[PDB]
Amino acid sequence: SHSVKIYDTCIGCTQCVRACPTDVLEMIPWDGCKAKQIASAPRTEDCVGCKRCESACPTDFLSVRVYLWHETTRSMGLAY
Amino acid sequence: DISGLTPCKDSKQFAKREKQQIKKLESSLKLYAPESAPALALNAQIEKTKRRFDNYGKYGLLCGSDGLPHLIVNGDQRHWGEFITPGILFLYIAGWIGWVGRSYLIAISGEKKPAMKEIIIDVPLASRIIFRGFIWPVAAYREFLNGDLIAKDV
Amino acid sequence: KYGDKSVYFDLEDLGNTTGQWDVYGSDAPSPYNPLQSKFFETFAAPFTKRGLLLKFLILGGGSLLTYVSANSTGDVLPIKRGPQEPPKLGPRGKL
Amino acid sequence: EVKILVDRDPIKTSFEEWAKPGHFSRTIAKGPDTTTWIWNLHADAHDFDSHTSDLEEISRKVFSAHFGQLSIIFLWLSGMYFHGARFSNYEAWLSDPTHIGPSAQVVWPIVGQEILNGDVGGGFRGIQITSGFFQIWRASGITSELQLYCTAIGALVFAALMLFAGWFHYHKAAPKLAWFQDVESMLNHHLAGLLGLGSLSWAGHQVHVSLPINQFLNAGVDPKEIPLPHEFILNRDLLAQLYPSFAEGATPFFTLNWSKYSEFLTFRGGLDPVTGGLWLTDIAHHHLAIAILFLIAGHMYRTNWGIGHGIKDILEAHKGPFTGQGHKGLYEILTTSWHAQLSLNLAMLGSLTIIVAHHMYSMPPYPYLATDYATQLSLFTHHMWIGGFLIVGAAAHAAIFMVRDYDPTNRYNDLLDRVLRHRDAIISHLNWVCIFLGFHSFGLYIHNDTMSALGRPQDMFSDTAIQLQPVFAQWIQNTHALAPGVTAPGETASTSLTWGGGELVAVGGKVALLPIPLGTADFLVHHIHAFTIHVTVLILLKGVLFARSSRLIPDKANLGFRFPCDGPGRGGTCQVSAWDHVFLGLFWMYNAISVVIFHFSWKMQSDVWGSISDQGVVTHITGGNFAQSSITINGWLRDFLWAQASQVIQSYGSSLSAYGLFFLGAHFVWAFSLMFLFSGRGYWQELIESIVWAHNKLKVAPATQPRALSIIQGRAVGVTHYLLGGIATTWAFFLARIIAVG
Amino acid sequence: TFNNLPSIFVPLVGLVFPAIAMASLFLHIQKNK
Amino acid sequence: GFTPPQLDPNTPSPIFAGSTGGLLRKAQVEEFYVITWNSPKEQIFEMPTGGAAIMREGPNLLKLARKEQCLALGTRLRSKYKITYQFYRVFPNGEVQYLHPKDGVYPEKANPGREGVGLNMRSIGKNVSPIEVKFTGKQSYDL
Amino acid sequence: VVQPINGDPFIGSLETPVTSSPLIAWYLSNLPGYRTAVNPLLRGVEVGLAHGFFLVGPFVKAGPLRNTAYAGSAGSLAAAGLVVILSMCLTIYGISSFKEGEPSIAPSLTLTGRKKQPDQLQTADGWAKFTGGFFFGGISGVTWAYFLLYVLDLPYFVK
Numbered sequence A: 001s002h003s004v005k006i007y008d009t010c011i012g013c014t015q016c017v018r019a020c021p022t023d024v025l026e027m028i029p030w031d032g033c034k035a036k037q038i039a040s041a042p043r044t045e046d047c048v049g050c051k052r053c054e055s056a057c058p059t060d061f062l063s064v065r066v067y068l069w070h071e072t073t074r075s076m077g078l079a080y
Numbered sequence B: 001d002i003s004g005l006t007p008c009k010d011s012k013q014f015a016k017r018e019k020q021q022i023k024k025l026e027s028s029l030k031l032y033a034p035e036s037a038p039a040l041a042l043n044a045q046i047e048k049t050k051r052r053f054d055n056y057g058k059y060g061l062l063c064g065s066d067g068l069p070h071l072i073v074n075g076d077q078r079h080w081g082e083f084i085t086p087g088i089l090f091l092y093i094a095g096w097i098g099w100v101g102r103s104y105l106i107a108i109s110g111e112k113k114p115a116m117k118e119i120i121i122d123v124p125l126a127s128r129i130i131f132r133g134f135i136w137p138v139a140a141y142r143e144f145l146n147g148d149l150i151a152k153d154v
Numbered sequence C: 001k002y003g004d005k006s007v008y009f010d011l012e013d014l015g016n017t018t019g020q021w022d023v024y025g026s027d028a029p030s031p032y033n034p035l036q037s038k039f040f041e042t043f044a045a046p047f048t049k050r051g052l053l054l055k056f057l058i059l060g061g062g063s064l065l066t067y068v069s070a071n072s073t074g075d076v077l078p079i080k081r082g083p084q085e086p087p088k089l090g091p092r093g094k095l
Numbered sequence D: 001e002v003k004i005l006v007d008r009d010p011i012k013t014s015f016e017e018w019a020k021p022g023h024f025s026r027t028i029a030k031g032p033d034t035t036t037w038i039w040n041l042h043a044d045a046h047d048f049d050s051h052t053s054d055l056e057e058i059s060r061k062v063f064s065a066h067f068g069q070l071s072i073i074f075l076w077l078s079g080m081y082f083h084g085a086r087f088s089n090y091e092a093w094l095s096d097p098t099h100i101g102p103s104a105q106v107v108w109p110i111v112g113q114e115i116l117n118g119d120v121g122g123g124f125r126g127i128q129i130t131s132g133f134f135q136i137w138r139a140s141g142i143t144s145e146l147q148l149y150c151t152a153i154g155a156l157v158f159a160a161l162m163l164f165a166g167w168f169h170y171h172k173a174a175p176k177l178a179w180f181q182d183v184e185s186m187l188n189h190h191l192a193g194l195l196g197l198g199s200l201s202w203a204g205h206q207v208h209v210s211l212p213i214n215q216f217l218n219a220g221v222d223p224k225e226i227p228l229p230h231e232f233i234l235n236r237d238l239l240a241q242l243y244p245s246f247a248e249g250a251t252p253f254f255t256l257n258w259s260k261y262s263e264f265l266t267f268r269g270g271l272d273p274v275t276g277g278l279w280l281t282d283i284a285h286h287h288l289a290i291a292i293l294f295l296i297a298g299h300m301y302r303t304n305w306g307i308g309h310g311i312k313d314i315l316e317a318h319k320g321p322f323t324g325q326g327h328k329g330l331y332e333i334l335t336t337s338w339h340a341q342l343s344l345n346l347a348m349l350g351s352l353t354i355i356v357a358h359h360m361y362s363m364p365p366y367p368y369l370a371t372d373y374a375t376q377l378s379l380f381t382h383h384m385w386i387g388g389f390l391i392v393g394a395a396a397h398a399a400i401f402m403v404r405d406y407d408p409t410n411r412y413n414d415l416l417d418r419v420l421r422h423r424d425a426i427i428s429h430l431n432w433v434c435i436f437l438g439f440h441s442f443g444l445y446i447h448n449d450t451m452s453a454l455g456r457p458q459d460m461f462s463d464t465a466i467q468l469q470p471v472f473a474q475w476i477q478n479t480h481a482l483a484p485g486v487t488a489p490g491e492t493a494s495t496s497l498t499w500g501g502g503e504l505v506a507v508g509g510k511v512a513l514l515p516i517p518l519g520t521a522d523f524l525v526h527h528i529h530a531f532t533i534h535v536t537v538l539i540l541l542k543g544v545l546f547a548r549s550s551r552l553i554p555d556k557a558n559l560g561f562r563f564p565c566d567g568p569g570r571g572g573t574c575q576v577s578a579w580d581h582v583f584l585g586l587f588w589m590y591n592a593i594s595v596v597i598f599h600f601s602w603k604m605q606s607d608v609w610g611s612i613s614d615q616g617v618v619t620h621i622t623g624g625n626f627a628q629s630s631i632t633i634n635g636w637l638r639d640f641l642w643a644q645a646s647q648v649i650q651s652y653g654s655s656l657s658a659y660g661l662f663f664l665g666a667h668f669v670w671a672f673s674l675m676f677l678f679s680g681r682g683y684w685q686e687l688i689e690s691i692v693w694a695h696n697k698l699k700v701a702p703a704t705q706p707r708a709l710s711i712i713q714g715r716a717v718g719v720t721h722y723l724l725g726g727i728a729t730t731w732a733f734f735l736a737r738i739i740a741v742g
Numbered sequence E: 001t002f003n004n005l006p007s008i009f010v011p012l013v014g015l016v017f018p019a020i021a022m023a024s025l026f027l028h029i030q031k032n033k
Numbered sequence F: 001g002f003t004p005p006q007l008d009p010n011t012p013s014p015i016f017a018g019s020t021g022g023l024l025r026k027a028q029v030e031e032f033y034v035i036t037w038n039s040p041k042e043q044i045f046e047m048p049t050g051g052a053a054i055m056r057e058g059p060n061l062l063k064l065a066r067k068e069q070c071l072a073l074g075t076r077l078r079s080k081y082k083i084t085y086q087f088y089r090v091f092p093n094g095e096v097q098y099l100h101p102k103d104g105v106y107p108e109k110a111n112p113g114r115e116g117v118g119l120n121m122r123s124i125g126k127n128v129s130p131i132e133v134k135f136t137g138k139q140s141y142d143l
Numbered sequence G: 001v002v003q004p005i006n007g008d009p010f011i012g013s014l015e016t017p018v019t020s021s022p023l024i025a026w027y028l029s030n031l032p033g034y035r036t037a038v039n040p041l042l043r044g045v046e047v048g049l050a051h052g053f054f055l056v057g058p059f060v061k062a063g064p065l066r067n068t069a070y071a072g073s074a075g076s077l078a079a080a081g082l083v084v085i086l087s088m089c090l091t092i093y094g095i096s097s098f099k100e101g102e103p104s105i106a107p108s109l110t111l112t113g114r115k116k117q118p119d120q121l122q123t124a125d126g127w128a129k130f131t132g133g134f135f136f137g138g139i140s141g142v143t144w145a146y147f148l149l150y151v152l153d154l155p156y157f158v159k
């Protein structure tokens, strides 16, 4: 559904996923920062698009980035 | 006599506006005694109206067919009291406001937390600057020549 | 098991879990008389092909509508009766 | 049990925190990195539940804030009584109140605004007020301007006293939480002690001061000839000359021989036909009975002694069969939360303001109120608006309870849980009945409009084409007109004359509330009112219930009460917050109260108000064009809006010219509001950043970074400008319309 | 007959062409290949 | 191949008097996201479907409506009650997909064993304009 | 007796007296909307007859020609037209919701937990039989209401 992307300007603060209410994100090891971790987005099918991840990305503009795309029943957040 | 407008000192409908407003204020004047506060205030407003109309007559205002003063902005020397002299009077004050504000923001720019000086206005600083905008048309011109008016990108 | 003490996730019986229930869908047999049922069957089997039913419905309904509106006179709808009144001359002569 | 638990010198009186703005909050007490900070300095200013976590400091803050509000109201009443004393024609209005316009404000002659000082009457140039203070003062037996100045000075004194009281009860000796939580004593006192003794003391004024003075004012006596009020207290012969029951004193009272008090404590219901207001003789007896009732009601709750109902023991006693534990827990969620109490008191106070509006036109309690059509209209409209606003705030604060103070772990309630469980059923049936009412109340107007436009007036829903008569309201009307008799003897007449069997109270040339006939138009507009109320309750109740969770956002409480959205996801989830629900309910309250006051103005001007000549032929202000034109929207546009807005727009060069000025201005402010409600923050931030480039080019970059308004702030600005503009439009339109033709 | 063309085309168009169009378009919506 | 799924058994559900925010027909034809947690005591918690529920001492089980409901519940559990939780996805066919940690560890601790996807090795301004990917399925951000 | 549906608290409904009671559930279970095992044609016949009368009601007395002599006839004609349209929309519904031959999408379970047979109404041919019954019953109920308004005008209200 939605296309979440994490760019290399990350600082590995783990606020994107700790804010993400649908388990879309997960921190993985990395070698590009002092924290040695970066966020990944495997479960984009569960992505609703609420952008709580990028409302908590403390960078110049953003590192995590949500692109609104094909909306399915779970990206639209429907219990019916 | 320009733009098809007769002056107000020799207009008929302007005097008619005068007479009509005076009769309107006199109709509201025959309901009180001529020595009480309402009648005195009405007579004061009446003299205010009459002097107003006579002053608009004596300044050479141009009253159209509707009988109201139509201001000329084109730049006619007779009608610089309409726009150009009060326009300069405006721009002098407006640039005063802008220049004292700009010199204030530049004054607090070298502060640790400048924003608190925009909330809590440093009245001594501004008051020392508040008269520095009296000379804005020359200080701003030099800041434009010296390069201090417009900032550089870096 | 769905019938255990406060267990509602019988993973085998997912119908009872998800709520798939004919809440009032009685499986009781036909309460109608057989003869009138056969009568209705034989007299409504023409309306068994949904596509032919739709074509018949649209075309026959449009035909009946055009027939009613074309054969009806002004007694049943004033638009056909016509003015039956002289026309008023508009403002400024007629313009 | 109950006590005076109060701690001394908790907070220091100092300007040190005045100098540091935003001290109350953590994120705000560090500096304005942005401009939004200042909007957050005012937004959170009175959000004391967010400043602290303990209820003690919050209770002290709101207690002293109430003291500040009372100081403000005492200062406001000081202004009103003073302006009446000095800048008014009240001393002249008493002579000829049916023809002199009550005025209490004069403007300063500077820029031509002295036209506003008009010929109100009484040899006085001012503004025709529509507050009804003059009517109160005639009901309070003032008969002077000295008494008004003394009242203003005393009110200023009480304002200063309340200011000192707030300072004392926050900074010097602030009560702790055990004092506020003793709601038993609070109710025992506010019932018996505020409302009981207050009504008793006003009954004393009504018996000793208002009644004897109005017995002369209504009997053609000039106010200069009337004896002063204290002369009735000092000399009882003058008081007894009109009410001889005072010669016996309190011996009729204490011996229970009250039958010899009916000269001044009456039950002759109806309006005094000499002035159009209710009988003050009935109002004295009223406030007396209310004193007895609130005095016996304020001895209901146990405070310290073995007697009295513990409110926990009342609530826990009520436990429904399939309603669960019932009202258990409510004493702990009402006494440990100010927002719940605020919501409850706001809802009831608002509906009470509306009931005041409704009972102040149909039973005019003050002399020369019903004939001051401007005062009557303005007071009804005012109190209706206040009631709608208070109800909408009750919704907001119910939502704030549900987000913040609601705790099913510690402060549990059963009935609230049961309401949250089937909240979808509540909102579904409300969302249905709103559509049903919308259709069968407004589509009827559309049907009438179309049938009248197709030349089919025999097919409308009118009093001539298709009968939709209010049979139930007609039955209540006819049985309240024939109520004096078997059901309510000893009343001598109906309690009101807004019913078909009543009569006309001719006061001067005016009519003053003859019966109100209910036809099909009243049916249609009353169902429109039910419709608008039901939609407002839909929006507001939905916000309250789904304040915490929905199928869309199940963690809405963690996002807060006042948040814009949770992103464009889920198709978009704008305005899921209860704040945004109440922001919409504001608009729907506006539509509701606007059509309500339109119904009032038109039904009054067409079927009630007017002028009755000495021959008896009453001619109404419009001409009875309500039941024929208020069945279609084009009548409201033509015969109400277009026609009655021929005195606000033609009032240019008149004394009513500020009304047309604010007509256009409130129009403007409403439309300006549409810039906020329609737009979004992102456009304005991008524009602001462009003009910030233009500023940084000239070394005029402000450190308080220019930020476009927050989304919720854009919505707040939109709804407040929208409401202010629509409401000031209506205020100007009503006041000019009703002062001009009067 | 020219005065009777309103009696044929308006009930034809404004009722049947919605029948045909909305039906065929609902079928085109609810389709699978 | 280091953390196996847990395959939730027929555990008891919390004590709850029933609400209207529960499972609609979405569960009857699509997934409905069971959650499982393990309580130290019989305590009371707000349900994401509105209303208060009484969790049971020991393992619990809740089939609420969707992913955000169970994850909001689990975050409230982990923060307020300090309790391990894991939730699933129950398609109507019968399969039970394990989803929340997918590694035995919550998705904040950067624990190795998870491949990075949705990962553009550039700053966010260095994406090509749409004209450079006009008439191509890749929109702007997949190169 | 407001306990949840089938005692299942996490299903969005409740067994309140209005839904699940001996009288109202019985009434909702012995009427042609919920007679699952029986064929849908008789169900649709019953439904159409009832709604044909219910529609002829507010067309004769309430309408454009209610006061005329053409009140009953033209009102019944408009009711038959609305019935034809209702069968029309029912038909597109049966075409759009389920295609030709799939099994029934109705629940195969009941409150007591019995794996009952699915309601063949929800199938294509079943819904088509239901629509045919609805059309036949509705035109028949329209003309029978017209007949009763014709021959038995006096007991009914005119006003």
Ligand code: CLA
Pocket: D011, D012, D013, D014, D015, D016, D017, D018, D019, D023, D024, D060, D061, D062, D064, D065, D067, D068, D069, D163, D164, D165, D166, D167, D170, D171
């Ligand atoms: C005049 C003497 C005085 C002084 C020096 C203080 C000093 C203080 N008070 Mg106290 N207080 C006073 C009088 C005083 N108070 C009175 C008379 C009351 C009763 C209303 C209170 C009630 C009170 C409360 C309840 C609280 C304080 C608090 C405070 C502290 C912070 C206040 C602040 O920064 O906001 C400064 C605010 C203002 C200058 C303006 C406030 C608005 C005033 C009261 C009324 C406005 C009327 C105006 C006409 C209405 C607007 C309409 C207009 C558009 C026409 C500070 C120690 C706070 C505190 O210590 O908590 C940490 C706190 O919570 N005070």
Ligand code: CLA
Pocket: D131, D132, D133, D135, D136, D194, D195, D349, D352, D353, D356, D366, D379, D382, D383, D386
């Ligand atoms: C924005 C707030 C606001 C404003 C500006 C006004 C302004 C006005 N009101 Mg309104 N009013 C309001 C809110 C407001 N009211 C609310 C919320 C209520 C509901 C309680 C009322 C009830 C009310 C009544 C009943 C009357 C007014 C009157 C007036 C006018 C004269 C003012 C006055 O004090 O006379 C003096 C005030 C009175 C004579 C009122 C008597 C006291 C009332 C009946 C009860 C006592 C209050 C009680 C202690 C607190 C509530 C208890 C709780 C159980 C509900 C003036 C137009 C009076 C009027 O129009 O006169 C022409 C009038 O008769 N108002």
Ligand code: CLA
Pocket: D042, D043, D044, D045, D046, D047, D048, D342, D346, D389, D390, D391, D392, D393, D394, D396, D397, D400, D561, D562, D579, D582, D583, D586, D720, D724
């Ligand atoms: C008894 C009455 C009462 C009380 C005690 C409160 C108290 C409170 N309310 Mg509630 N509220 C009320 C009535 C009341 N309100 C009503 C009648 C409404 C309906 C609109 C609301 C709607 C409401 C909402 C929707 C919200 C609150 C919030 C709040 C809290 C903070 C408000 C704040 O800091 O703003 C301080 C004051 C201001 C910011 C000034 C407001 C400016 C107004 C709109 C100016 C324009 C109105 C004016 C009459 C027109 C003249 C214009 C002229 C100046 C040119 C506070 C607990 C907020 C809250 O709890 O947040 C968590 C919140 O979100 N209230």
Ligand code: CLA
Pocket: D430, D431, D432, D434, D435, D436, D437, D438, D439, D442, D443, D444, D446, D535, D538, D539, D584, D585, D587, D588
């Ligand atoms: C005149 C403008 C207007 C109209 C017509 C509506 C209409 C409606 N609003 Mg909206 N609304 C408006 C302005 C308007 N709103 C504005 C400006 C706001 C800003 C705050 C809102 C905010 C708002 C909220 C927040 C809510 C509504 C709700 C409602 C509904 C209540 C009435 C209803 O369904 O009954 C029936 C419909 C009407 C009365 C509308 C008029 C229709 C006429 C009678 C007949 C139409 C013709 C007919 C069907 C033939 C069709 C012909 C064919 C060719 C198409 C309805 C959808 C509420 C809702 O959805 O729940 C009920 C709700 O909660 N509205």
Ligand SMILES: CC1=C(/C=C/C(C)=C/C=C/C(C)=C/C=C/C=C(C)/C=C/C=C(C)/C=C/C2=C(C)CCCC2(C)C)C(C)(C)CCC1
Pocket: D073, D193, D194, D197, D198, D199, D201, D202
């Ligand atoms: C609503 C409102 C208003 C108004 C109000 C009013 C007007 C009120 C009134 C009220 C009142 C009118 C009150 C009163 C009170 C009183 C009191 C509170 C008293 C007390 C007293 C005492 C306490 C005493 C005691 C004693 C004695 C001396 C005798 C015997 C012994 C003893 C000791 C018991 C306004 C508009 C402003 C605004 C809005 C709000």
Ligand SMILES: CC1=C(/C=C/C(C)=C/C=C/C(C)=C\C=C\C=C(C)\C=C\C=C(C)\C=C\C2=C(C)CCCC2(C)C)C(C)(C)CCC1
Pocket: B073, B074, B075, B083, B084, B094, B095, B096, B097, B098, B099, B102, B136, B140, B149, D698
């Ligand atoms: C004569 C006249 C006229 C015309 C005129 C014109 C046409 C003009 C133009 C002009 C122009 C075309 C101009 C331009 C300019 C530009 C620019 C570019 C500028 C800049 C500036 C600046 C930058 C400044 C700044 C400042 C100041 C100095 C003030 C305050 C502060 C500040 C800093 C803001 C007319 C006939 C109508 C009328 C009469 C008069």
Ligand SMILES: CC1=C(C/C=C(\C)CCC[C@H](C)CCC[C@H](C)CCCC(C)C)C(=O)c2ccccc2C1=O
Pocket: D675, D676, D677, D678, D679, D680, D681, D682, D684, D685, D707, D708, D709, D710, D711, D713, D714, D715
């Ligand atoms: C216009 C607009 C804005 C921009 C509105 C701005 C920020 C208000 C303009 C600035 C105000 C007037 C502050 C400037 C005045 C200061 C007090 C500075 C004083 C300077 C002199 C006047 C004394 C939004 O941010 C917005 C957000 C969401 C939905 C709609 C909208 C919207 O419609």
